[PDB]
Amino acid sequence: MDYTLTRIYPLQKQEIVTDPLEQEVNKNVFMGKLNDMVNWGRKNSIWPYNFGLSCCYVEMVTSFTLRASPRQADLMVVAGTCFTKMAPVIQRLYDQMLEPKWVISMGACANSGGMYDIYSVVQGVDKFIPVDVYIPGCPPRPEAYMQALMLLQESIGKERRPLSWVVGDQGVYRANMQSERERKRGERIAVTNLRTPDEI
Amino acid sequence: AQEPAWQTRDHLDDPVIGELRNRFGPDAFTVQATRTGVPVVWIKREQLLEVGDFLKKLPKPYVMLFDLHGMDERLRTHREGLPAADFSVFYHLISIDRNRDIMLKVALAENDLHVPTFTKLFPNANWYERETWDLFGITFDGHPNLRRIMMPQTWKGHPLRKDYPARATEFSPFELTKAKQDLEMEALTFKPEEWGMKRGTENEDFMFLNLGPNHPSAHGAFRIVLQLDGEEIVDCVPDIGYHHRGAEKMGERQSWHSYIPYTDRIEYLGGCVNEMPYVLAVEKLAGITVPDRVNVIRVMLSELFRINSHLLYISTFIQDVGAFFAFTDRQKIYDLVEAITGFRMHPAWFRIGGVAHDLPRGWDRLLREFLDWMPKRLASYEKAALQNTILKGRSQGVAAYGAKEALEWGTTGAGLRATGIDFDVRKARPYSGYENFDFEIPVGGGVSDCYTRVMLKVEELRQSLRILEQCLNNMPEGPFKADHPLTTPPPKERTLQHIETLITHFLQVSWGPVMPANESFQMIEATKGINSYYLTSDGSTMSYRTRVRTPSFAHLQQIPAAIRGSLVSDLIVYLGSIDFVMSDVDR
Amino acid sequence: MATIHVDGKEYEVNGADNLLEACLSLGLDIPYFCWHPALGSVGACRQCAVKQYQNAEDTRGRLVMSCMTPASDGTFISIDDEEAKQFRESVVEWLMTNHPHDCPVCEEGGNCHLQDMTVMTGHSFRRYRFTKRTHRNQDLGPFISHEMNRCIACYRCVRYYKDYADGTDLGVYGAHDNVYFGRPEDGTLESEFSGNLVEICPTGVFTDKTHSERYNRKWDMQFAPSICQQCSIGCNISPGERYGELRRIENRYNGTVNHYFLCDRGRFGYGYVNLKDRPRQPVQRRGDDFITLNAEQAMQGAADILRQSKKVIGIGSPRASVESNFALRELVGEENFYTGIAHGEQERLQLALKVLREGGIYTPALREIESYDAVLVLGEDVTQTGARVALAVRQAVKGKAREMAAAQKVADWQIAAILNIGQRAKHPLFVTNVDDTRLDDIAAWTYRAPVEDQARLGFAIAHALDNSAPAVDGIEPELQSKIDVIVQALAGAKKPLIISGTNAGSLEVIQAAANVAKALKGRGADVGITMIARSVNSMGLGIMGGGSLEEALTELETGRADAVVVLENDLHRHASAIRVNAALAKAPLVMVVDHQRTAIMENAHLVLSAASFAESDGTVINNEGRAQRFFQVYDPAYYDSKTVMLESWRWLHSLHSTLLSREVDWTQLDHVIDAVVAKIPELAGIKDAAPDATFRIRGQKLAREPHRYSGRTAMRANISVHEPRQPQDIDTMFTFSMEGNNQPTAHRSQVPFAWAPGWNSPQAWNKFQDEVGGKLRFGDPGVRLFETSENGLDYFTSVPARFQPQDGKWRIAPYYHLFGSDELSQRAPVFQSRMPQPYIKLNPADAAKLGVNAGTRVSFSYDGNTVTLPVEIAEGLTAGQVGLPMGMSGIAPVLAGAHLEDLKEAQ
Amino acid sequence: MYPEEPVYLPPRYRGRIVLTRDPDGEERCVACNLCAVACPVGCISLQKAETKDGRWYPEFFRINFSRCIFCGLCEEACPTTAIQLTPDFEMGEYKRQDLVYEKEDLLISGPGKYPEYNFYRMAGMAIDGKDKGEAENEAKPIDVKSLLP
Ligand code: SF4
Ligand code: SF4
Ligand code: SF4
Ligand code: SF4
Ligand code: SF4
Ligand code: SF4
Ligand code: FES
Ligand SMILES: [Ca+2]
Ligand SMILES: [Cl-]
């Protein structure tokens, strides 16, 4: 598994590296156990902050069926169009969160601007805010967010973040995971026949 | 009449034309023939206030300014019989007593884009004129505070102008940085006058009530600048434009068919209810009379979404104000819509001439099941409101207004009916074969308070269920797409096997359907009020102008006049009673 | 002229026109197929049906064909009559009965007149349930594809190919519903104007194979108004690009120049732009090491060497633009600027210019040529050098029939009648060449003789028309009889036309033509003079002036010059390869700015990646002296960001700045244009050739992409999911996007492409013209640099002596090929098949003397080099002369007039 | 519940877009670019290519699902029933670049929702297998040199 080191957004240190733990110089069975324990607690305790924008927030509340403060949130779900007047607000809320933090882009608009390539819309939240999981759709089905959360859990269980801010390497090593598209290419292509669009 | 509804008409027979001719003289105005369905009159800029007052002072007078916006006519080639103009401003006025409307149009020259303000005659014109200035650059002389309403105040250029690029510019971190700073320094650099507000007895606290993720109710995220005297509201200014996605500008970059997806995204909770007014207006431009089955299909889908929106609105109001699970009932509707459209929130199923596909086999079973589940569920919804003393106590007599306020602020829907004015487009101006359905319009008793508004929405659910039952038991058998040369796309089975239909499809899905030069207008009763589409074709495959009048924009401009003197708690209840979404307000 | 009443509304139209032409020019829409603004009216498809009433009281009129009905005064017609609409829809239905279901897989989809008319007639429902007729297709060569199933029998192809272009290999075969349109047998269409069939055919029977390989729909093409660069005629074209490759070249209507027709060399000879061996980034040669540099590094390093250079000379090219050549002139100095042309070629070009700029005789525009009543071509093989002029000469020769028909009061649009009245009657045409010409079919006489004898004929005709003209001695009585016929034909002509050029390789043939034209002018005749050059900006380089390539080489040879900046010139087509290569090897610095990989680049120290016409903006001057501006079609760095292909003027201007200030200056095109008009007063009209970059239509820039362009968020997704920023244009008034204006009523003259709602086919030009078949509504683009002078030139008294065969020496006669003679077009791959195989032509007698036959390979020495070529027998070629394919790689065009020595059977 | 309990999606559900094949196993796509122009977001890019027989096909087919709104306008625009929105909603990714699918991630091994439709059996353009006159409602070519009147 290769990792991307974000040592100390559009432009920042992104050096592809090897598992820092596997490196013998910094290889300790105890340290590895500690890393796994922290990753386990974080992936099984992702408190969310749903920034409600446009129509995607409505699908999100259906899935909900709260860390009202960005301070208590570990994940910011950008669900809606990134309007010009809203972009400063989104950046401020994300900048009022503490490490570790994650961002899931839900919807074509948050992903790339979607059908709204217009003068009053930022073409993607990834133009100003780092994103971890992208959910295609418009609006993405409530169940799609659940899949995205599970994908984030997997990515979080493989991260190598500093165990303490006073000792060790303060670098966030994120694993270069395999694309879901290539992972499930086989089953998708094998599909042959489908139900005719004639019945309910 | 034998003559088709889409036929271009000058409406000179309308009595108002004779009244204007006998008052201002025959050479004071030019009547334009259109497919809008309303007399269109071109008045001079120096008679706008004179004509307006006369219309306001007539037997059965014009009492409501439905819409006021601008139009850039510098690239319009087909302007035969229209006064010379580089820009124009249109005024849509409605006379409920005579059930008739008039469109007053004023020609402007590029060098002098100045028009007398209409705020004195109709108070709702304040926001419309600000939007016209923001997107066109037309100055309304006499306007109290003419500042941008949809774009940042620092925005350079007028977006809806033809010379203005439509696509997004390169993201600039610097602008975000500066924008973020300005936001952090807003409290320090606050001037009340900039928001139209004035400091009074002093010590009065100006405050910004952010209504986003702190108080999220699927209404969107906006802020209201509140001037308080303790907890009483002395004055408030709703800050909007935070959900503007340039939908009207997109109409000029999309074909008549490729724009349908965008219509559903003006009011997301309405779905097919948003594409009904657009398809009907494009069909008037095309001269298409849709078959009876399409009429009933388009009513059925619309009423399913009308129930969906009301359920969520009633559920949220009751949850916050009082103490009605929408999720379950809303899912059953989404399941039928998904089976028919293949999508839930944004069906984009309606087409120019019909619906994208035919009803899926088994639709009747699903509809019958839902029509056998809601009866009881609705009984629970009303019982609560009827016997929730907490709700009644916190809602009755809050943000109350009468008929005069509803008419002066363009309020439509439950708000207008609560004041006792019985004006529902489905009955007043029947469309989509609604005249073939037996239903009643819930009307209030003279006072539009938070409780009366919600109660009417509950009584509307019962009437919608009645229409859905008639749709299920009287679904006509026949075409789901009109037999017109401009139906888009043509029936697929024929496209797949016939060259003539293949050719028609190829061009209609590529360059686009060519709509002859004309102006159309269709107003419909949406889930939150009267929504309309003023479409202008210059004889091309894309719209020259797509004006979307949305009820939410007007309902948010009445807030200052209806909440002044009340407490912030009352404002939050009012905001809930107004069924509104910021997507409908900002478009 | 006449008052007509269409659907009640009254209109003023020309009574000399047909109702179709009149109503179309009024903006009224009537479906049609068989009628063409240039081919006249025939009345076949019966689609333009309109109801006609006898008076204003007639309520029961008759269905007539608008194309075959005069727009007479007091005409009452209705296009919206229900019966007319029903009949017009029925005509389309009948055409759809046997029409193939191949829209998705046909190359006319979205550009098909038949698709446009089906929709306009409102026919979307099929009632026919029987079988559809099928036809097997034919091979029509490497440019045109055949799909007869998609035919509608409008007869447009046969009427254009045979009655307009005078072709003989296309025809209509069969009868009833089994009518077939194609060649009598499978083979390559032989007409040099066969490509126009793709736009003439209203369906997809004839298509462009050069595009079919990388086919894209019209809505996905980025178009720009450009001028064709394959010869000196300067035809307006609409090059189109998709995914960073030139996909197709379409005709841009110029009612003053090419109107509706191009020639095969310009329509199918652009593949050189899509070659993958083209320079894309600046590269420096360090010994045997090649280093890719960036624009900034390239400028700094080059200026450093140039700053320490004793003398920097610059060699220009007739292929380069006026701005590009001027930039080199300013960088090296006018005294050190040399036109990359041979001394003789420059002399002939300057003589041709002097005739047009100081001869006192009007030079006609391409379309105006079709109105002369007598033509004399002296030494110019137009069909192979300026093909579009040959097409115009053909229409001029057909004037006799039009005149004869007008005498019988027959309408100008009734072509069938005009042709029957005419029969084989034609206006006098006389052509002179070293051998056979393609215009021999319509010529009254063809003089096949050495260039000297061809010139003597001109001096002779001049003396006969005016005794004051120098007389010629040695004319045999037989020739004198033939000369008299030409003299009487030119003397009897009311509007004579003399056509010459620099392709003959003789200064005397240009002087002879000048004398003949002066003689006719003296006799008070509307004489016209036309001179055919060789390249797109030959006349422009001629006006600018400069030393010859020979003089430039001598500077480098004496060593007086150390640095040579060559601009878009291979140098081997204008001078000996041995001399050029040696001279370029003695230069400390050799910089080459070209958009194509040439041989001289191999030993260049620095090679700047210049842009081609598709990726550049500039002004070129045609043979008539019209300065026309071409605009950039697409950004070369959009897909590949590493690409640094800049305009030659931008490269040279920046280098000059870095040389003087050590700072780079990539200026705007307008600034360079302003510099040219200020420094060179002769090239001052270039400023008015096109509006500047500040020009707007109601605030909007002109657009290059159609409004339905697709793939905006997916075309470059493979490179980066993040969509790139719209390429910006600071040089022209065109946007590299659809966010602009392409209205048919926009007050402009530069139209990137023709599209109007309901008209997606090339028939959409009708909505961009003042009158269908006329000129662009707001004027045709282009400015003539010079007007006819008040005074003329004195007669040239230098009559050459008759040609004499010399044992040993073999005069090289110039044979030109539309496919092969041009440099860039030969690089295009699709031209390899059409181009001729290498040959030498010999007089049958000379072949017998050398004891060689057809096919025999013969060895001969030119510049100290033995070359072997297969022998071809040319009876028309006079003895003592050998025929070589001028321009074909190896045979440089300069060889014309030179002599071969050791000509013997090889091996 | 999800993901343990799968979700019933109706047959017309507008989800992951796939390219389909004809009952003969050949790709149904002819690279006409109708789905792309009809697309309101411009998230489809393809290039026409031709087999030696003369069959049109997409040399490359790219769909940016980061911009896709799953509206079905492209599926409604095919004259060949090749592009189809299938009942699938799980397409979440880690990098946006991986939301750009190519033909390898789109071309399935079956006919999809439309079981038996071949445009090439309706077209008049000859291909390997179908010669002139072998399409539906198509007569056999009659030579102009035929002796029959
Ligand atoms: S992606 Fe679609 S559904 Fe989601 S917010 Fe944007 S427009 Fe609305
Ligand atoms: S010629 Fe035109 S109508 Fe016929 S198949 Fe081709 S595109 Fe379609
Ligand atoms: S091949 Fe083209 S031009 Fe010739 S008859 Fe057929 S459709 Fe007309
Ligand atoms: S005649 Fe010359 S300019 Fe015109 S198309 Fe042919 S090569 Fe190009
Ligand atoms: S998917 Fe269908 S519409 Fe798109 S290019 Fe292929 S055949 Fe044409
Ligand atoms: S589903 Fe809609 S947005 Fe997606 S590719 Fe098809 S047309 Fe474009
Ligand atoms: S166009 Fe008039 S008969 Fe064909
Ligand atoms: Ca340029
Ligand atoms: Cl002689």
Description of the structure:
This is part of a larger assembly, with chains A (200 residues), B (587 residues), C (907 residues) and D (149 residues). Chain B folds into 2 domains: 15-141, 2-Layer Sandwich (Beta Polymerase, domain 2); 247-586, Orthogonal Bundle (Cytochrome-c3 Hydrogenase, chain B), CATH 1.10.645.10. Chain B has 22 helices and 15 strands. Chain B has helices spanning 15-24, 48-56, 125-136, 173-184, 247-250, 260-263, 272-286, 292-321, 326-341, 363-370, 374-387, 389-395, 403-408, 414-418, 425-428, 450-473, 492-495, 499-509, 551-555, 559-563, 568-577, 582-586, and strands at 29-32, 40-43, 64-72, 87-95, 100-108, 114-116, 139-141, 205-210, 223-229, 232-239, 350-351, 354-355, 518-525, 530-537, 545-549. In chain B, strands 1-2-5-4-3 form a 5-stranded mixed sheet. In chain B, strands 8-9-10 form a 3-stranded antiparallel sheet. Chain C has a domain at 809-905: Barwin-like endoglucanases (Beta Barrel). Chain C has 25 helices and 37 strands. In chain C, the strands form 9 sheets. Chain C has a 7-stranded mixed sheet with strand order 15-14-25-24-23-16-17, sandwiched between helices. Chain C has a 7-stranded mixed sheet with strand order 36-31-35-32-34-33-37. Chain C starts with a strand and ends with a strand. By secondary structure, chain D is mainly beta. In chain D, strands 2-3-5 form a 3-stranded antiparallel sheet. Chain D has a two-stranded antiparallel sheet with strand order 1-4. Chains in contact: A-B, A-C, A-D, B-C, B-D, C-D. Residues 54-56, 80-81, 107-109, 114, 138-139 of chain A line the site of one iron/sulfur cluster. The PDB classes it as membrane protein. Keywords: Respiratory chain, Complex I, NADH ubiquinone oxidoreductase, electron transport, proton transport, membrane protein. Cryo-EM structure of E. coli complex I variant V96P/N142M (NuoE). Chain A: NADH-quinone oxidoreductase subunit B.
